[PDB]
């Protein structure tokens, strides 16, 4: 493909844990040519810590990651031989 990735962007949800459930983010880049397409399914998503967090997803899932606490996770999205990492707090809206 002549069109390059000319930005990488991260689309919601914010930076937000629930109590005990799984979470979903979608990736968003902008090619060069001015175009826009979901990578989501392109880019795999993972988190350092593995101990207190995995994530499974199947095609149609890719980018569900499931965090029962860590305090502070980090999940990295890996684009071909493009990455870009990002910090997630651990927030519970209520008990």
């Given at each position: ?5 000319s ?6 949800i914010?930076t ?11 990736a ?10 979901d990578?989501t ?5 993972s ?10 997803n ?5 980018g ?9 996770p980090?999940?990295?999205?890996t ?6 990492n990002?910090?997630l ?6 008990t």
């Amino acid at each position: 493909s002549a069109a390059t990735l000319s930005s990488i962007s991260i689309s919601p949800i914010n930076t937000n844990i629930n109590t005990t459930v799984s979470k979903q983010f979608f990736a968003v880049g902008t090619y060069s040519d001015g175009t826009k397409a979901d990578l989501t399914s392109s880019v795999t998503w993972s988190s350092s810590n593995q101990s207190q967090a995995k994530v499974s997803n199947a095609s149609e899932t890719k980018g569900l990651v499931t965090g029962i606490a860590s305090g502070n996770p980090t999940i990295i999205a890996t684009y071909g031989s493009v990455s870009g990492n990002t910090i997630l707090t651990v927030n519970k809206t209520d008990t």
